[PDB]
Design an enzyme around this catalytic site. Structure first.
Site, mmCIF file in Angstrom:
data_model
loop_
_atom_site.group_PDB
_atom_site.id
_atom_site.type_symbol
_atom_site.label_atom_id
_atom_site.label_comp_id
_atom_site.label_asym_id
_atom_site.label_seq_id
_atom_site.Cartn_x
_atom_site.Cartn_y
_atom_site.Cartn_z
ATOM 1 N N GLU A 131 8.627 0.336 2.431
ATOM 2 C CA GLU A 131 7.729 -0.247 2.089
ATOM 3 C C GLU A 131 6.621 -0.249 3.413
ATOM 4 O OE1 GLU A 131 8.044 -3.798 -0.373
ATOM 5 O OE2 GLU A 131 9.384 -2.942 -1.822
ATOM 6 N N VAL A 132 4.953 0.080 3.158
ATOM 7 C CA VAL A 132 4.037 -0.757 3.744
ATOM 8 C C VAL A 132 3.296 -1.403 3.175
ATOM 9 C CG1 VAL A 132 2.146 0.196 5.066
ATOM 10 C CG2 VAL A 132 3.948 1.714 4.581
ATOM 11 N N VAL A 190 1.014 -1.320 0.424
ATOM 12 C CA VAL A 190 0.131 0.088 -0.154
ATOM 13 C C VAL A 190 0.725 1.170 0.097
ATOM 14 C CG1 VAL A 190 -2.230 -0.741 0.812
ATOM 15 C CG2 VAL A 190 -0.281 -0.215 2.845
ATOM 16 N N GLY A 191 2.252 0.934 -0.047
ATOM 17 C CA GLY A 191 3.280 2.211 0.008
ATOM 18 C C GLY A 191 4.669 1.571 -0.414
ATOM 19 N N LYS A 192 5.402 2.210 -0.991
ATOM 20 C CA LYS A 192 6.303 2.565 -1.715
ATOM 21 C C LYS A 192 7.136 3.557 -1.515
ATOM 22 N N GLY A 193 8.589 3.895 -1.066
ATOM 23 C CA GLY A 193 9.254 5.022 -0.878
ATOM 24 C C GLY A 193 10.292 4.562 -0.403
ATOM 25 N N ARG A 194 11.599 6.155 -0.172
ATOM 26 C CA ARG A 194 12.870 6.576 0.000
ATOM 27 C C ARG A 194 12.716 5.176 1.660
ATOM 28 N N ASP A 234 7.884 15.636 11.418
ATOM 29 C CA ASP A 234 7.789 15.700 10.563
ATOM 30 C C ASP A 234 6.113 15.429 10.683
ATOM 31 O OD1 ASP A 234 7.854 15.370 7.567
ATOM 32 O OD2 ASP A 234 8.138 13.406 7.674
HETATM 33 C C1 LIG Z 1 2.132 6.713 7.038
HETATM 34 O O1 LIG Z 1 3.044 5.727 7.627
HETATM 35 C C2 LIG Z 1 2.744 4.713 8.111
HETATM 36 C C3 LIG Z 1 1.252 4.638 7.151
HETATM 37 C C4 LIG Z 1 0.594 2.838 7.932
HETATM 38 C C5 LIG Z 1 -0.974 2.468 7.416
HETATM 39 C C6 LIG Z 1 -1.270 2.316 8.329
HETATM 40 N N1 LIG Z 1 -2.778 1.601 7.763
HETATM 41 C C7 LIG Z 1 -2.834 1.769 6.300
HETATM 42 C C8 LIG Z 1 -2.444 2.243 4.972
HETATM 43 C C9 LIG Z 1 -2.786 2.734 4.033
HETATM 44 C C10 LIG Z 1 -3.574 1.394 3.392
HETATM 45 C C11 LIG Z 1 -4.419 1.979 2.556
HETATM 46 C C12 LIG Z 1 -3.780 2.809 1.192
HETATM 47 C C13 LIG Z 1 -4.004 2.909 -0.480
HETATM 48 C C14 LIG Z 1 -4.956 1.207 -0.029
HETATM 49 C C15 LIG Z 1 -5.192 1.487 -2.465
HETATM 50 N N2 LIG Z 1 -6.303 2.509 -2.519
HETATM 51 C C16 LIG Z 1 -6.062 2.418 -3.044
HETATM 52 C C17 LIG Z 1 -5.840 3.746 -1.488
HETATM 53 C C18 LIG Z 1 -5.744 3.837 0.146
HETATM 54 C C19 LIG Z 1 -3.020 2.932 2.146
HETATM 55 C C20 LIG Z 1 -2.038 3.800 3.613
HETATM 56 C C21 LIG Z 1 -0.975 2.794 5.108
HETATM 57 C C22 LIG Z 1 0.235 3.359 4.553
HETATM 58 C C23 LIG Z 1 1.633 1.832 8.304
HETATM 59 C C24 LIG Z 1 2.852 2.826 8.793
HETATM 60 O O2 LIG Z 1 3.458 1.536 9.976
HETATM 61 C C25 LIG Z 1 3.240 0.129 10.008
HETATM 62 C C26 LIG Z 1 3.090 3.740 8.561
HETATM 63 O O3 LIG Z 1 4.235 4.474 8.714
HETATM 64 C C27 LIG Z 1 4.783 4.616 10.562
#
Ligand SMILES: COc1cc(-c2cncc(-c3ccc(C4CCN(C)CC4)cc3)c2C)cc(OC)c1OC
Ligand SMILES: COc1cc(-c2cncc(-c3ccc(C4CCN(C)CC4)cc3)c2C)cc(OC)c1OC
Ligand SMILES: COc1cc(-c2cncc(-c3ccc(C4CCN(C)CC4)cc3)c2C)cc(OC)c1OC
Length: 284
Positions: free
Chosen positions: A21-22, A14-18, A134
């Site tokens: 990944e998440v 659900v996330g990729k960056g510097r 941040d």
């Molecule tokens: C900012 O940072 C952190 C975030 C998270 C985190 C926790 N819940 C859910 C998310 C997520 C889920 C789903 C989507 C998308 C899927 C596709 N759709 C089209 C739109 C939505 C985006 C985001 C995340 C990224 C965890 C972290 O650490 C484990 C993080 O770092 C501290």
């Protein structure tokens, strides 16, 4: 004597960056979020882990900790942070297509202020005071109940640099009083005011809304340099635009005043997170 189930199934990125990944993962039937750290960002895992080893934060507007994992590999260490999973994703993500009404806008911003005041306040007997360092819309997640939670304590300080677009003037001109913990709270308040502006733009009034834009979109490049930001924020003393249409709406009029009081050049003039909460509870 007992089985310790540690397997996590990684289902989708659900996330990729510097930062790495998440992933959305599954543990014992339950969604979790798994941040896999790049070698670039290992110190963020250590800092967040050290903070949670000091104080187990538990607040509805702070992303919920589950685990910090370090696993030995043939030629590397793998570092994972496991948290609650918010399927709606980040505030940045959410504001791209969603517009807001008065109730949803206020619920979002008061939930962020609540999370931030909780970080900032020292509690005796409790928790140390914490500055985030941040704060931005990509570090805020949207919950199904309409409140948000603050994420990413990899740069947090208890009593990597911040994202340049959100840096306060005293960070950009290097006048920040680095031996005063209050200095770091005041940097967060500046960033909070930018987040407030990003959200308020998406609140509909009289059939009008602004498109999502990041702070300073109209005066710095897509990927601004430190110097780009210093010239805007410090030398010319620019602030984000407040559209005329906000002054026909009582909520957006009150939010414009609030964000102005987060953006004073003089860091000691800015509102505290607790004062922002109180102001927000008296709007509407
Ligand atoms: C900012 O940072 C952190 C975030 C998270 C985190 C926790 N819940 C859910 C998310 C997520 C889920 C789903 C989507 C998308 C899927 C596709 N759709 C089209 C739109 C939505 C985006 C985001 C995340 C990224 C965890 C972290 O650490 C484990 C993080 O770092 C501290
Ligand atoms: C090591 O690693 C991971 C472990 C777990 C996990 C799995 N089952 C059970 C547990 C558990 C919790 C607590 C106790 C207590 C019982 C009371 N007594 C006073 C002392 C001990 C025992 C067992 C854990 C912590 C999940 C993980 O991921 C979600 C882990 O990996 C990060
Ligand atoms: C890491 O995260 C999760 C962990 C667990 C989990 C699994 N086994 C056992 C436990 C546990 C039991 C008992 C105590 C205490 C109770 C009182 N006193 C006697 C001290 C001991 C602590 C811990 C937990 C908390 C479940 C989770 O979700 C359902 C977790 O979240 C993903």
């Amino acid at each position: 004597q007992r089985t310790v189930a540690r397997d996590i199934t990684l289902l989708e990125c659900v996330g990729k960056g510097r930062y790495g990944e998440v992933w959305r993962g599954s543990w014992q039937g339950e969604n979790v979020a798994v941040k896999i750290f790049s070698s670039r960002d290992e110190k963020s895992w250590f800092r967040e882990t050290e903070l949670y080893n000091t104080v187990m934060l538990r607040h509805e507007n702070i992303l919920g900790f589950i685990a910090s994992d370090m696993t030995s590999r043939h030629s590397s260490t793998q570092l994972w942070l496991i948290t609650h999973y918010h399927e709606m994703g980040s505030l940045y993500d959410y504001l791209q297509l969603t517009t807001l009404d008065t109730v949803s806008c206020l619920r979002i911003v008061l939930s962020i202020a609540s999370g931030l005041a909780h970080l900032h306040i020292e509690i005796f007997g409790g928790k140390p005071a914490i500055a985030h360092r941040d704060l931005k819309s990509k570090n805020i997640l949207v919950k199904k109940n309409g409140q948000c939670c603050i994420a990413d304590l990899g740069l947090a300080v208890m009593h990597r640099v911040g994202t340049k677009r959100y840096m306060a003037p005293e960070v950009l001109d290097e006048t920040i009083q680095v031996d005063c913990f209050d200095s770091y709270k005041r940097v967060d308040i500046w960033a909070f005011g930018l987040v407030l502006w990003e959200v308020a733009r998406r609140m509909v009034s009289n059939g009008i809304v602004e498109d999502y834009k990041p702070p300073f979109y109209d005066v710095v490049p897509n990927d601004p340099s430190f110097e780009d930001m210093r010239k805007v924020v410090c030398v010319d003393q620019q602030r984000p635009n407040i559209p005329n249409r906000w002054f026909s709406d009582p909520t957006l009029t009150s939010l414009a005043k609030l964000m102005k009081e987060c953006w004073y050049q003089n860091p000691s003039a800015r509102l505290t997170a607790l004062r922002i909460k109180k102001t927000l509870t008296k709007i509407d």
